[model samples]
Target chain A: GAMVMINKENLSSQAKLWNFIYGFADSLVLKSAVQLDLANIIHNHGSPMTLSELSLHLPSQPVNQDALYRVLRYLVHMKLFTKSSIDGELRYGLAPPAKFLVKGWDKCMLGAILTITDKDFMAPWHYLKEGILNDGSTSTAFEKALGTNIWDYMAEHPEKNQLFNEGMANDTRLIMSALVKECSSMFDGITTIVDVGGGTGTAVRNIAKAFPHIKCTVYDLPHVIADSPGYTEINSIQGDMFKYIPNADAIMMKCILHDWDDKECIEILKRCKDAVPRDGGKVIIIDIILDVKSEHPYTKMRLTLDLDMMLNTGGKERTEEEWKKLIHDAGYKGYKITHISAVQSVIEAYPY
Target chain B: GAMVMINKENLSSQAKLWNFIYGFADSLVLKSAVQLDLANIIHNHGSPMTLSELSLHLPSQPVNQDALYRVLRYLVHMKLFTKSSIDGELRYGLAPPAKFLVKGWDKCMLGAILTITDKDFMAPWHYLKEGILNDGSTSTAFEKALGTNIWDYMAEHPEKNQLFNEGMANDTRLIMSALVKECSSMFDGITTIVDVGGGTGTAVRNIAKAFPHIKCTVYDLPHVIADSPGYTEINSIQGDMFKYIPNADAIMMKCILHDWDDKECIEILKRCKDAVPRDGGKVIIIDIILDVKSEHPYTKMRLTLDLDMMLNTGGKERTEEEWKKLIHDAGYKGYKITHISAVQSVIEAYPY
Candidate 1:
């Protein structure tokens, strides 16, 4: 008998759903790879390692070799790693993306990756609609899922809080590496800057290192800055941004204002105005600007981050018009935005 | 500064991790879409419906419209549904994949889709490695995560059990539709057939309807078939297949043996042989043939199912060689496999 066939449309439609449904599998596979430190092991080997050779270096029990093989095969399909056959043996090696998975790498994103996949962070996403569907009582999906605000929850769990900080620090490292090297003109003429809401001096230290003549200070909540490691030419100041910020020649805020609503953001900006000197000093804001008109590849990442903010903090990524209104409402004279990366931009607000 | 550019290799490598990390976001988005019955709502409208119009049909609270819009937008990106702007209003319409999501449609896969997305099923995937690394004294990942074996867990949770059964029934509907229409020649001259381990008579009834000349019986565990709905020209028998099965000229098992290991499968196949007469009787099996040799699109689904079985049961999808060995060990003379779907195949084993 001939093969029983479904039409291409039907088949492809089913395939799409199949892919979406198995999306969780991809996430768990990546997580397993991270936990096993597969990339690091391969890198340390310094040569293409066969399955048995790789197995010897993996931390998982011997019983888990078969499972690791399957996991590695799936990751190979994902291009997170590569597989090659050399002299009748299947060898595994790191893919370019695996560079970020290696611990202690300059551009490693493993911390940030692990932060989002953490069970606490992931569970809230499941209730993404709960906050949106309910009254002010819910506030955010994270609150709805865990019965506490994210910051408060983090306060209670020190390890997870550290993980969140680690993620933020890694993200800062990536952004600052680009900002210091590519957008150095944004910092020219500024002699002193205070990084508002900066957790532990990751970004500010980079700025200080890049511009040795300028002094940088990390200003965050008291609990966040307590015992912060001191960096050369960098100072740590503990304070609340809503009430007071340390006075500086320039006020820098990266990925901070978006965590609040327009009204709260306006209040924060007003505080920024109070802190910075009126002479030529600017408030530097770095965050995603929602672009509905562009077809850039990074647009998807920005939109997903927007959704993540909605789920976790009741925060949002703003459009150009939205950012313009907020700046105007906060009484800023003018602003200019420099495209940083597809996912982020730098907006300089003047106090003139 | 020429963008202080990283190499394209570096940029895309980072992009890969970014995409993989966001993979969970896709799964949860699809799950939320399914939970909201978004596809069915749009289909019922029978036209491109604006967000408000679609929201009106949704069961979620009125405040959830914004969240619903986000979910629909994400699903649109996935091509599960399509979005368009009509008369200055954003509208949504069903895509081909939406057909499978609409309930009550013949051959609909909605049930199967929902079953995998269920929290009960998803939670176990996180513990995948734990099961692989542990001893036999430990249970499967499903049990480890849920605190009970799948069957026992199902027996207690009537709603989830019903959902799972519905998924199986829907799968059976799709397979049987093709089988009855395309493979009627296989049923020719068969006097009687018993569908061993058939749950609720889904397959046997389809067989009965297709070939009225063949007497068909649904054979399953006592608890499973106790309240089986009577089907036209089909009989439901309640008994354990491990010990006893009703006599028949042909015995059918669909997606059953793949849930058990080789030893258990051999025992079941032995019982199947005992239930059939030596004269021209055959055992028909429908399950996945794990094909590592092929890079077909459907191979991912099959391999994912194989991993799923490892997580939920100790069972596995077998390769062609593995199937041959299993059949040989079960005392069958020979078996011929017919390619059914990309993910499934039919095996006819004869005792000569």
Candidate 2:
């Protein structure tokens, strides 16, 4: 009944063999549940629903109720749902984590990310062990698995491109919420804001909605913003942030900085700095602030997100020191991280 | 920040996908660690060891210390290791649960069970959805993947066979130790005992060692007992427990009943009853007594283990009622089970 020790003396060769050689089952079962859309069903039901309620509303056709209950039993154990009783009826309710899958909710941008990473993005992780031994150039996980760069594949597949774009939009929903709430003072006295590389105008949409007094215009590549619907009273112009940004009181960038190396970020920031006015004008940087205080547990999540971002897009989170150097090189006079919001924050870089 | 809903509703699908698709990593890392004997290394050291200690003593040459640290980090997060610091040096020790992997510890049976389920026996779980559909006849997961049943495969491969026998021996050690220590009264007045299907004589060996006055013999298939070096001292005569068993004052079966159906169990029990003395005779059964005891977290683990048994061996932990009927129908007069352990226990079936 007490704890037992593994005979690691001989290096536990058999135990290792058993776990590695046979560890694929748990993974496949979990993936099977996701592809089947079990989480969405639980989400659509509005509140914690009992097994009978779930069974009645499940996407799959009617079958053995007990068997279905058994499947959900595993899900509940995994903390995908909360197991509780209501009026002597065995019921399951959504846990804090499970609430994310409800389609069309405010915080729901992860849908696109999930769809893109499904079976397609998953193949790369399987190749990571091999990727490590090769030259650094061959170490990109996605490139090793798909035989082409992920960006090239995206350009070729319009559906994936849209899905990824949508996913990024979802990502921005979280980042923008953090930015507007934590760094509200950055936009004080600013009448006009230009969002660079803003996908379909997500960040600008939030900023414009929060402070209607500020006129918002988005500058992105034609293909990225093309055919994307516009928010009311906001401009969605077809232009590249890398080349130029429209003259405005402030230039906002949500997730763009991490995608570029220091040189590229400097170039992008330089253009934005040139576009902003000399008085009460700044470039708003919204990205993860690495080395924020002592590394928190949530920092693991941010680091992991950054790793995923780097794997998919050639970008990574930079330390505050690293960020400051890049800003200084970009022809900017000074910058201040006005507020800290978990992993991502807002930076105001002024054109002195 | 307050526990504001992070729009998890927006990202539930993504989280579910990540959890399931990547769930295999958990098992794989566990597998790799067990196979490499990391648990044993910690066990042998008898204290928490640092990364330097591990790297210094690892079996392989030219070790990538960082990679190994990463592996251990993952395992430690899984709770397979207890992380601590001693004298300002980061060190690792076998946690309570990890001790099951230590050879010769009766608690080590779980290591065997985990190993068997994760290794050669795991392929069957891949067809769980399919298995439910076909009434469980076709799509044997192992056959589909490895072209054979798990038992047959193990029998054919001597190394695998040894691994399996060792596993059973380990199970017997752990389960029997707990039962003998915690429920010793079950066998107090017994003059003779039959260990039905006792693999390689480990259970009877330990029982005989602990209780010397009681004559003990391992009753199993002739092939199983005939040449096993491990069963040399005991009366290892071969006979099926279902058809016939040697005369004994009490029948002691360890970790055997879980593998049979109710009908098969009745047949086995009938033979057990015929072999025992009529006055004050009994059958001491050692197995998991499945009860939906409470809405506690551990209930999930019990349920999961039950599912593992059902999936792999077509056996399961029986609720108290299920055990009673089998015992009663097999001509036993009464039965009593003292709640001995969470995972394993003893049930005394009386036929006086």
Candidate 3:
């Protein structure tokens, strides 16, 4: 039993195994550098920046530039950043991936994702195994670790709440702006639309601006809708949609459905249903559908968001079957899903 | 500032970013599966073992077969295990890399490396950032988190200690056997040789058996020498190499210098240099030499091993320059390093 000869091919595959296992360290170190705004400093320097140039402009003090370069070598291997030769001196410049991490111009995209990481959203990642096994998982691993949900925590800290809303707004702006231009027909017919739980009305304001003929109302909790400054083109309704939604031709919900249970979604949907006309009115849902068959590299991106919802909000990404069940229970007789984008599809549900 | 247009490639890249940021979930899921020995079970079954067939034999009760499949799917993506179709049923078999993980194998090269993920090792990874940045930079991140290093912890637990030693022995068996067979001429001129810290004299005994004319002594700690049974042409000796090594014609230090600092390495090397014959004697070192050149994959692997050593153990991998300095300090007149294998090399140092 002990004299078995081991195969050599098995040993050759160790490279991939070792690299894959320790890959996270590389990611985290890059993340830390991003958090420190190291790339931005180099970008602002405008030319190929040396280690000294990077160290001089970097935000943190007591920085070990040599140590920083070691990490840079790892990142260079990743091709996120590149090393350049200028007059025999070695310096660094941004690769396409790293240019977005630069401060000006392209900051909005990666900035939002980074802000999400800083938010309690990362907490749920710790309890993911338990989350898969536990009954009625939380919205995020962050919430599981924090003992309080993201919303409750946000409510307690207005500063973080503002940061969260800004990040979400930035994300929606980046995604929906392109989405609206590409798939404009999705919002063609709605004359009077109510944005349920619209924070500062950024999404609906964009829609209202694009199609000025459409009357837009931004509805949310009284506190959220307070002093509706700069939210032009859309009137603010201070009330909970679950209790009652103001009558409108169409009701919009973006990134909202995943935060509520099926029963809660039904309650919210029933309110929206009662507010709209049975024949022509609809509830427009702009949220992830957890559909893996949906094409795009972004399709796989849903799982982490699904996990995030589970950890922090006690919500989840619903499959088509689950979504349909909720729609039926919500008193909507017919619904159609238009995958406007890989991230947020447009769902028009209504009573038949 | 707000309405910048994001390109299609930019959007696609963002999606990939989203996936990588959440790869932790996939990693943890795989870790859990490995702990359960699922690969070994499927491997031993030697057929298309259905999910039902495998579930019945697991150590855990009330198995979540559905949950188990999700983990398996990720592992399948990793190619650690391959899925096969058999008579309209699905089965799994260990892929080449995973075959190294089979417990009974004599040359399990990955065994020690894989053990780096256990609770003790994992604690270090968890606090690696803190450990690197703090006064305990050389102390293991595991020790910082758990209040004890893995070696100390292993010593307290004999079963785990045995597993750890077996892991090391397995790697040595593979490397040493291959070296003996492939480069047997390296031992041609030696009348006598000392295997520094050769545990149980097994390696030395094998070397002696291969070359009957050469006399070999297994020089190790008193405890290690006491546990030895016997050797054919190899004798066991109890002594500390740092203080004094036996007067052998040539001294061999395999996989030892990687665990000590430069000063300590110099001390050990001096003792060995003192024992060797002035003309033909040399300190033969079998350890990884850091290659800063980008052309070699081993360079990156060595960097990772260096990081691992720095974080888990206080030892650091030496660059050629650092190695030269140590050799000169040890009173060795010159040293020459030959590329013996991809991962390890042979360094001959003596007063020639």
Candidate 4:
């Protein structure tokens, strides 16, 4: 009798299992929404738009009204959009999360979503099983899938490379805007800050605009800086990060270290330490510090991103202890991490 | 000033934005875990398997220990696996949801995950935008992407067809198991029941085994019943559902009507109504009932699945009102819906 009935616990577990299996639909639908520019359409509508009216605004004409409505229904379920009844018709409106899809918003996340969901960008994920099943010295999933590493692959494809860069810059703006707002004190007493590995001065631009007292500069590879559109708030200098970093009151690197293995990361951090003033200067590193202790909604996401990094770059997100080891091994005297954001923390490492 | 600072509300919204963008990674990583058979490996182990032991048991040799550990770590974060300190080495064990990943389990979900993530199955999703952007009469995304609908495509590819059938059967086992355990009373007075559109008699087998007093016959297309492996507890008959259904005390259909349009569904229901005894017979339907009022974790998942059905079968999940309309319009006297599982509900429709 007991075995004939399904356990309530198993029922819930099965529900979650189905949900995880339904993961790709979650992303692909969202990607379709961005591709449809559904968020911006609703945002520009000036009011919640009904299905017929909303369908008329889409760039593509004669769209399947029911299909578009279903997509909107999914977004509403994901909390990215809302539907309210007015005049006997349900009207679609932008929800809080959908604000990120609005192009002009400083913290808009559309770029990354678009680029990541692109066919080429999504290809690597298919080889994760083969990549993980190999020896430790094997190539990354990206390399295995594409027959080349991400960097070299991007080098040959200018359009995708640019897409990737813009995506990174958009996310950089989102994070840096949050950083300066929540932890402005980290910039106190700093006269000059050099953003090592920063591309096109996106992160540095945020710093320069937020802290006018602190002069900001972007230090990246020559080729990357070659693509810079040039910014008024920040200066850009290109060089080899492993060999040298521009001298500054503080060295900043946002999400750059996670793109390299530990050995490469230490070399970059060592150069960062060498470039900063030894007595008072610090190397401000912006990266993921895996802390399972602090529970939040982003915990699962952050950890999954760790695997994502491994597949894409052969890099890893480290624990605090691992961070400490990397920092001390790079000859830093001491460091403190300020957890201001869900995805990353600001680690201020003092030079030896 | 408000715009400069990240509001707490904005911060959480931004977090969710990143999470949705990271959706593929969640499913992909879990896919890799299953590909590696991590759940089955740990379940086979007499004790919690250490990373070294786990890696050794994998089909692939000399796997990256750290890489394997990270994958397991993600599983732990996803609540699919557990990690515990055993003799100073972290050991991995299957978590509740992962029980579905264990191969021998009656309700193992491996088949569906594998089939859904397969290249062919995955191809259709990419066309969702283009499909939805087309005119109302345009083909389904599955048809648009593969140059044929799912049913025809599978018909030509026997291997993929079998995979799809097995996948559906596995999920049917899970749902039917839950149904019999929770709502066995529905079968109390019925002497005979026919499973319309049932494949391989999977759902009927479950009902017949649980209620031996009742006769179970699976009514489906000729080719489908032709492939059945002769079940001891059930009978199989082949025919067109739209034209005629095998007469029984009651008629049963699991996730079938959602595959048809309203007109098609009304016809099928009309035939089903004609097949059952008007004096005391009824129609038993097990499928998704879109009721936003019932709050549960599977709410979002069930809604997203509505889109899934759209892409694959050009079908739509019906709301309660829509279901009522569909049922009453199809010549049923009345029906009662029992919300038992998260993803679906059981409907008992009395024949006129």
lDDT of each: 0.78, 0.65, 0.67, 0.81
Chain A TM-score of model 3 comes to: 0.83
Candidate achieving the largest lDDT:
4
Off by over 4 Å in 4: A1-10, A87-89, A135-137, A178-194, A207-227, A230-250, A274-282, B1-10, B135-137, B178-194, B207-251, B274-283, B336-342, B348-352
Off by over 4 Å in 2: A1-53, A75-97, A108-352, B1-53, B69-168, B188-194, B197-201, B212-230, B235-277, B295-298, B325-331
Q: Which ranges in model 1 have alpha carbons more than 4 Å from their true place?
A: A1-9, A135-137, A226-233, B1-10, B135-137, B226-233
Candidate with the larger TM-score of 1 and 3: 1
What is the Å distance of residue A297 in model 4 from its true position?
Answer: 4.8
* CAPRI band for model 3: incorrect
Ordered list by TM-score, greatest first = 1, 4, 3, 2
Candidate 3 deviant stretches above 4 angstroms: A1-7, A10-12, A105-174, A189-279, A287-296, A299-351, B1-7, B83-96, B106-114, B118-177, B183-272, B275-280, B295-300, B314-351
Taking all chains together, each candidate's TM-score versus the true structure is: 0.92, 0.66, 0.76, 0.88
lDDT of 2 by residue, A152-263 (tens): 6766777766776777787777556656766778879999988887777777888888998999998776767763785669988886666667999888887789887677
What lDDT tens digits, residue by residue, belong to model 2 across residues B1-352?
Answer: 2135643233334444444434555554554565556778877777888887876676555454544555565566556677777999989887655755565554554456455544345555655554333343543445555567655665566666666677677656645655667777766888778888777788888888888888888877654564367544467777767667888888888668887668888888888888787888888887877665545323444555555555555566677888988898898899888765435567888876
Between prediction 2 and prediction 3, the one with superior DockQ is 3
**What value does the lDDT take at residue A84 in candidate 3?**
79
For candidate 2, the TM-score of chain A alone versus the native chain A is 0.80
Model 3 lDDT tens row, B1-352:
3335445545566665555455444545455555566767876776557778877776555565654565565566667777778889988778777765566654454455445434345444445344324432445655776577755665466565555555556556656766677657678799998989676565686788788888999887665555567665577888777877988888888777887778889888888888888878877887788865544645655676665665566566777888889889888889888764446777878765
Instruction: Supply the TM-score for candidate 3.
Output: 0.76
